[PDB]
Design a binder for this molecule. Structure first.
Ligand SMILES: OC[C@H]1O[C@@H](n2cnc3cc(Cl)c(Cl)cc32)[C@H](O)[C@@H]1O
Lengths: 252, 315
């Protein structure tokens, strides 16, 4: 059912990777790396952030079933992006995704000869891994795109242009930097991102004309207590990520 | 060694029985679950050449089947693998299709049964169109029926999603869709901004095929077809079909000039009920945006007259 790709704290603790020697902390960065590689390749291949996000989720879900010790993120990400792009209506050719993967991962080395057996096998390899990704995901590739949720919550609080841009930024970074999307529904994540965005922007969302808090209009299950914990975790990771907070930092 | 695979079962859990995917396309097997005897259909994913990985059009089909969950739409149960490697789409099996029944002369439909068939068919079109999907391959062959008399639209291998076309940019959808005989005029004239109406036309050709037991407009090519259509619906003109001129292929395809609408008439001999005739007529309309839709088609007096739609047991 619709609880299959959602996990508990304890489940996240006992990941496939954990059972193979990988610390929580190491694994979390493995995802962050793969997510970077995705973002980098996606930008160079000129696909949408939506497509890249889809890939990142394929990546996250994938590693709740497989371990980084068997499948290195550098091999899985290109395959995941190659898949995401077809799924989302922006197919990139297999050669092209391989060229771009290569430059990203070896900015020095030169692309082999398409004629080579070396190259021909890395083509077979990507196609194989796309296959393993498909199987691992149980062929369930329709993702609930999280941006649109955020947009509707900023509209729902007549947010400034700036307050929405900041929200969108939290939103995107949470996907790269946390496993929130494996733990909480897209509606909730967006509340998290809008809450943190308000705090950062020192913006106060007025209580309802009733007394109801803004988030109750989005996901009944959302309690302030929760937002505070999630926005805390997100912010800690942000503070650890060089130059990132600089992008939304008021300088005037 | 081996990779964990919790959510994709090996197709060997089903026991193949017999090729049923005729037209020689798809490679479809009837099969039986080795534990419960439950029957299913296995549609193997072609893969002929496919030099771009898992076929994009298969991903499309699998997306659409997963989104469409409804009593009148075929039902994808799961997708299965092999261990080159193969991928099978697994459906709930359905004993009959409407082509098989319409050709077999041992089979006969009371007016009311027909009514039910149309009702189910139109209901399913309502559902898919509501979900922003075009079937794009309506033909009796793709209309199944179960033992218990439930009709289901199937084979979404050509299906695609469609969008509300505003922002001053008409869509560019594939034109050469839908079998020739059940293809509508819009597509022959090379339309690329088409919608739900192209399926409704199919549904027409099928309404009549319920009495004539035979696809009512058989054509050799797109040109023989388009004439044969006009030799039933009238001549294509801005008068009958506003702005039909703008299609490059209109006058640029030697369309027969002199033809008046002979649809009710050429069909009276087969279908007696004047209500059925009227519906068939409002479905075989030339101008898409003048052709009847699934909603209105269902509220048509046809479905609310004696005899009332009856369940199906005559099969
Ligand atoms: O590949 C398209 C052709 O194969 C058969 N077919 C396709 N999907 C199917 C699903 C089921 Cl449950 C059945 Cl019984 C037949 C199917 C249909 O008979 C159709 O004509």
């Amino acid at each position: 059912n619709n609880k299959r790709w959602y996990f508990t704290r304890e489940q996240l603790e006992n990941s496939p990777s954990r059972r193979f020697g990988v610390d929580p902390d190491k694994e979390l960065s493995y995802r962050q790396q793969a997510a970077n590689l995705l973002q980098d390749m996606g930008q160079r291949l000129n696909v949408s952030q939506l497509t890249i996000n889809t890939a990142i989720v394929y990546m996250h879900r994938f590693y709740m079933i497989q371990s980084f010790t068997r499948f290195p993120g550098n091999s899985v990400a290109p395959a995941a992006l190659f898949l995401a792009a077809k799924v989302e209506g922006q197919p990139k050719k297999l050669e092209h995704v391989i060229k771009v993967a290569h430059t990203c991962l070896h900015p020095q080395e030169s692309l082999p000869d398409t004629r080579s057996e070396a190259y021909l096998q890395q083509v077979q390899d990507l196609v194989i891994l796309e296959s393993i990704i498909l199987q691992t995901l149980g062929f369930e590739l329709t993702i609930d795109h999280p941006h649109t949720h955020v947009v509707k919550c900023t509209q729902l609080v007549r947010a400034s242009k700036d307050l929405a841009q900041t929200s969108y930024f939290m939103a995107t970074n949470s996907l790269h930097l946390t496993t929130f999307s494996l733990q909480y529904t897209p509606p909730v994540v967006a509340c998290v991102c809008i809450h943190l965005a308000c705090k950062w922007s020192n913006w106060e969302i007025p209580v309802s004309t009733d007394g109801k808090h803004w988030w109750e209009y989005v996901d009944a299950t959302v309690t302030l207590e929760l937002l505070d914990e999630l926005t805390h975790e997100l912010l800690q990771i942000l503070e650890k990520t060089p130059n990132r907070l600089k992008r939304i930092w008021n300088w005037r | 060694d081996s990779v964990e695979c919790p959510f994709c079962d090996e197709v060997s859990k089903y026991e193949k029985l017999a090729k049923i995917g005729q037209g020689t396309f798809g490679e479809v097997f009837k099969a039986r679950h080795r534990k419960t005897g439950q029957k299913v259909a296995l549609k193997k994913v072609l893969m002929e050449n496919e030099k771009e990985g898992f076929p994009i059009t298969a991903l499309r089909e699998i997306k659409i089947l997963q989104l469409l969950k409804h009593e009148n739409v075929v039902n994808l149960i799961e997708i299965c693998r092999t261990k080159k490697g193969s991928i099978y789409l697994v459906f709930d099996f359905c004993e009959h299709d409407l082509a098989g029944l319409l050709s077999n002369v041992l089979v006969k439909f009371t007016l009311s049964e027909i009514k039910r068939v149309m009702q189910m068919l139109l209901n399913g079109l309502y559902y898919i169109h509501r979900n922003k999907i075009l079937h794009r391959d309506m033909k009796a062959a793709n209309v199944l029926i179960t033992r218990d008399g439930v009709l289901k639209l199937a084979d979404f291998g050509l299906a695609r999603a469609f969008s509300l076309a505003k922002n001053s940019q008409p869509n560019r959808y594939t034109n050469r869709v839908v079998t020739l005989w059940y293809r509508p005029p819009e597509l022959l004239l090379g339309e690329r901004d088409y919608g739900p109406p192209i399926d409704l036309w199919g549904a027409g050709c099928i309404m009549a095929e319920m009495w004539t037991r035979s696809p009512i407009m058989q054509g050799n090519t797109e040109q023989h077809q388009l004439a044969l259509i006009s030799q039933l619906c009238g001549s294509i003109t801005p008068e009958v079909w506003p702005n039909v001129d703008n299609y490059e292929l209109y006058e640029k395809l030697e369309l027969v000039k002199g033809q008046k609408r002979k649809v009710k008439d050429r069909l009276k001999a087969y279908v007696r009920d004047p209500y059925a005739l009227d519906l068939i007529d409002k479905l075989l309309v030339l101008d898409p945006a003048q052709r009847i839709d699934s909603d209105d088609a269902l509220n048509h007096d046809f479905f609310w007259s004696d005899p009332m739609p009856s369940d199906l047991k005559g099969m």
